[PDB]
């Protein structure tokens, strides 16, 4: 009885369901769906004072499922919750679709990692892809959940749209000085090195191929069934040893490195965001904020970044958070003497 | 340099830079993905108290992993006609994705060198009377203007910072 | 092309007429092109 359903879900179809597909397909379909519902139809006028739908007039770059109203706090904003009282429209005007999307997305991400584990167990391979997927989930939980929980409200989370993310990026520089954050520097290093490794390994394989065909199109020199290497690891090791000084000699270590580099970068950036939830910032170097203030001649690129951050902060915040009602007169706004 | 460039050119709304970001983040995705797949379908050669990297010998002719098993896993993960069966095509794609996208983002820096900046959507959504409804691009402008009026402070004697 | 002859039309026209009749603006509380400035950020939680 109970075994029949297990045998059902483990079947070979066009899309594998599995047991994880109960916690993945009902959530992901909602989260993805609530984005398309949001970015087509609902406004951010009552949460943000901005327009963020195709119905407003926005395009794909400037639509978002923006974060909830700043007065909603860290409320879950359930549809039946007190802030909507079951009323659908009042739930969409206060940014309840952001919480719908974010919660269904984190459950979809859990369901997808469970799916990766389940399919590895069914087929019988190691679960390294789920381990590698723990880095996007660490980043998702840091950016969309841990950061707004550490802040005032869900409002300061990232909106589910392109330009909302661009605002989030510039907000993080101006208010957080996030480029100066070393955990983010390791994140950048990990991601850039992951892209370097991807490119260099693909081109190295493609240029150390064996003559396993007769045509000039070398893409037909490989069969799925063959048990032999399609590219010379010896020639590749020789080339990179005499170009770069070092080379891989172990194929398994190479492909573990290709796993390890972007995953650990992405995890280190998640650590940096976890720090920015509590405002624990690598904002400044105390020695240089001191020296530049005892010496009106000491200019470094860092001091010019601190000035740029103040310029961003004062010239964004009056329309970034409109619940705060920041009033800055034109003559306290830091200008650079236009 | 990044902040001043955003202030003066709005690179975030430049499509070549969106391609560059897709390239670097997707090259990291595909690097982690290809590495986890080759690592996950390794042929058993070693014991548990020794590194799996000892299963490969430098210059061995035999394939050190199972393309079939990694392929079957990836295909069950998304759909049937998605997983690269072929490996030569697979590594051409691993080469091509971040290389082509970094070509495009280098080209984006280069056309912004001639002041051909990114997309501009300020004052683009108007109401019935004509009032500008702010969008998210407007908020990005407002932060870029923040950066814009603070860079090279004692060096713009006229209001128009040209190139 | 038989059982879907009108099925694809009826659905597409349904979405078109959902926008065109104005039901979308009332469906999601979206401000119409002249309800923006007759600006109201909601300032309270339990009663928006």
């Amino acid at each position: 009885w109970i075994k029949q359903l297990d045998d059902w879900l483990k079947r070979d179809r066009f899309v594998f369901i599995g047991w994880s597909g109960l916690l993945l397909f009902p959530c992901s379909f909602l989260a993805i769906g609530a984005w398309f519902t949001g970015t087509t139809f609902v406004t951010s006028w009552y949460t943000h004072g901005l327009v963020s739908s195709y119905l407003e007039g926005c395009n794909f770059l400037t639509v978002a499922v923006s974060t909830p109203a700043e007065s909603m706090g860290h409320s879950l904003l359930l549809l039946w919750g007190p802030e909507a009282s079951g009323d659908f429209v009042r739930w969409c005007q206060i940014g309840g679709l952001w919480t719908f999307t974010a919660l269904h997305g984190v459950f979809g991400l859990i369901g997808f990692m469970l799916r990766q584990i389940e399919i590895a167990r069914l087929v019988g391979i190691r679960p390294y892809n789920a381990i590698a997927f723990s880095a996007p989930i660490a980043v998702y939980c840091a950016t969309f959940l841990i950061y707004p929980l550490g802040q005032s409200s869900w409002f300061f989370g990232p909106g589910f749209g392109v330009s909302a993310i661009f605002r989030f990026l510039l907000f993080f520089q101006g208010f957080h000085n996030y480029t100066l954050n070393p955990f983010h520097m390791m994140g950048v290093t990990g991601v850039l090195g992951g892209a370097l490794l991807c490119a260099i390994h693909g081109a190295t394989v493609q240029n150390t191929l064996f003559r396993d065909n007769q045509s000039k199109n070398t893409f037909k020199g490989f069969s799925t069934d063959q048990g032999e290497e399609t590219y010379s690891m010896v020639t590749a090791n020789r080339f990179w040893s005499q170009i770069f000084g070092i080379a891989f000699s172990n194929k398994r270590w190479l492909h573990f490195f290709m796993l390890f580099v972007p995953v650990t970068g992405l995890w280190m950036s998640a650590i940096g965001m976890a720090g920015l939830a509590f405002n624990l910032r690598a904002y400044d170097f105390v020695s240089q904020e001191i020296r530049a203030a005892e010496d009106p001649e000491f200019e470094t690129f860092y001091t010019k970044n601190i000035l740029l951050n103040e310029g961003l902060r004062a010239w964004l915040s009056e329309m970034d958070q409109p619940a705060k009602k920041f009033v800055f007169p034109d003559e306290v706004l830091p200008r650079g003497f236009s | 340099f990044m902040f001043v460039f955003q202030a003066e050119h709005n690179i975030l709304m430049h499509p070549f830079h969106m391609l560059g970001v897709a390239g670097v983040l997707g090259g990291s995705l595909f690097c982690a993905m290809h590495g986890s797949l080759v690592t996950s379908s390794l042929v058993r050669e070693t014991s548990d108290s020794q590194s799996q990297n000892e299963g490969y010998k430098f210059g061995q002719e035999e394939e050190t992993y199972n393309i079939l098993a990694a392929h079957g896993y990836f295909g069950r993960l998304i759909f049937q006609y998605a997983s690269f069966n072929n490996s030569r095509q697979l590594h051409f794609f691993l080469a091509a994705w971040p290389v082509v996208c970094i070509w495009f983002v280098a080209l984006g820096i280069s056309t912004m060198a001639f002041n051909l900046n990114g997309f501009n959507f300020n004052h683009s959504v108007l109401d019935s009377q004509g009032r500008v409804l702010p969008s998210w691009a407007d908020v990005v402008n407002r932060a870029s203007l923040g950066f814009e009026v603070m860079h090279e402070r004692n060096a713009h004697n006229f209001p128009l910072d040209l190139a | 092309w038989i059982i879907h002859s009108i099925t694809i039309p009826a659905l597409f026209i349904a979405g078109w007429l959902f926008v065109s009749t104005g039901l979308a603006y009332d469906a999601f509380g979206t401000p119409r092109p002249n309800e923006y400035y007759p600006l109201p950020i909601v300032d309270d939680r339990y009663n928006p």
Binding site: - | D127 | F12, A14, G15
Partner: peptide
């Protein structure tokens, strides 16, 4: 009514509706 008929329609019965709505939005005078 099968599994094939639901995993190709729950994604596409809404999608054509959305596309029809968005095609109507290209003709809205605001």
């Amino acid at each position: 009514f099968t599994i094939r008929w639901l995993a190709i329609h729950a994604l596409a019965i809404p999608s054509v509706f959305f596309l029809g709505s968005i095609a109507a939005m290209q003709f809205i005078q605001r």
